[PDB]
């Protein structure tokens, strides 16, 4: 019944969802992001938001579905494979985590805004390779 909202109202609804996320209100934030992912099928921020909420609630497989779609919407964003790699790790899937942290390092290395993440992705990758070996 919310279909057809203006961008400016979507923006305020994204703000609302982001704020609930910052306050650790993950169930409520998840619902707001799930709404926005229905309203706008292409805005990667909404899928990042939905993923992050599910991750914080321990719903790793559902977090992976959101991160996977998001990554299709912004092929340059290092957060998707990075947080996906965390979920794979918590699921005991070392090969998935290694792939994600590898991709995240490559995406983050190409962008100066993401210099801290690049180093984290490299650190996590090294940690995971150490466990497989």
């Amino acid at each position: 019944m919310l279909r057809g909202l203006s961008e400016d109202t979507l923006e305020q609804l994204y703000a609302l969802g982001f704020n609930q996320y910052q306050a650790g209100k993950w169930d409520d934030a998840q619902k707001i992001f799930q709404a926005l992912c229905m309203l706008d099928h292409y805005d990667a921020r909404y899928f990042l938001g939905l993923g992050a909420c599910r991750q914080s609630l321990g719903l790793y497989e559902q977090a992976l579905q959101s991160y996977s779609y998001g990554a299709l919407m912004d092929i340059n964003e290092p957060r998707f494979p990075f947080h996906a790699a965390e979920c794979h790790l918590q699921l005991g899937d070392l090969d998935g985590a290694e792939s994600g942290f590898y991709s995240a390092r490559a995406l983050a290395a190409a962008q100066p805004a993401h210099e801290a993440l690049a180093a984290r992705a490299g650190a996590m990758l090294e940690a995971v390779t150490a466990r497989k070996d």
Partner: peptide, 8 residues
């Protein structure tokens, strides 16, 4: 945990 894009 995850760093989301700031709104406004």
């Amino acid at each position: 945990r995850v760093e989301l894009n700031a709104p406004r």
